[PDB]
Amino acid sequence: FQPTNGVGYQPYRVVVLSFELLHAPATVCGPKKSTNLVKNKCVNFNFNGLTGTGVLTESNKKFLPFQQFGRDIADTTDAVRDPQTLEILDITPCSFGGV
Amino acid sequence: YFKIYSKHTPINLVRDLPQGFSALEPLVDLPIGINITRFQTLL
C-alpha cells in the first residue's frame, strides 16, 4: 500500500467484533449506571434487581461480611446493604390507612 | 456455576473427627460451566 495511494487503493485497518453466546453463564457484560441515594422519603428503589417501594432509613443491625439483605418471620424483605457505601438500611412500608 | 464453601478451625486431637458444630461461610463462585464427574486430591 503506497504512502500516497488514492482512497480507492489506500490501506485500511479493520476489526471484526464477533459475538459468542454459548450454553453457560454469561461473562462479557455492559456497564450498569447507578442513580443517587435518597433517604426519609417514600421512594421506589432497586438494589441489584431487588425492587420495591418504601422508606429507606439508617439502622444498627450488623450483617455478616457476605450477606446482602435481611428478612422477617413472614419472609418479607426489611433491610438491605447498599452496594457501594456498605451500610445497612431499613425498609419501612409507605404509610396507608382508612378515613 | 461452581461453588466453594469453607471453614478453618484449631484442634488438638488425633486420628479422628471431633464432635462439634460449625457452619461454613461461602468462599467463591466461579462461572465455568463444565460437566464434572470425577476428582482427585494433590499433596
Binding site: 443491625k61 457476605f66 439483605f69 428478612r71 418471620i73 | 457452619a23 461461602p26
Partner: peptide, 28 residues
Amino acid sequence: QLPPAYTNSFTRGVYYPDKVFRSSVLHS
C-alpha cells in the same frame, strides 16, 4: 497396601444456603 477405613461424621457440613440475614429465628 491396606483396606479402606471409615468413620462417622456426627454433625458436620452445614453451610449457609444463601446470602440472607435472619436473626433469632428457626428456618426450614
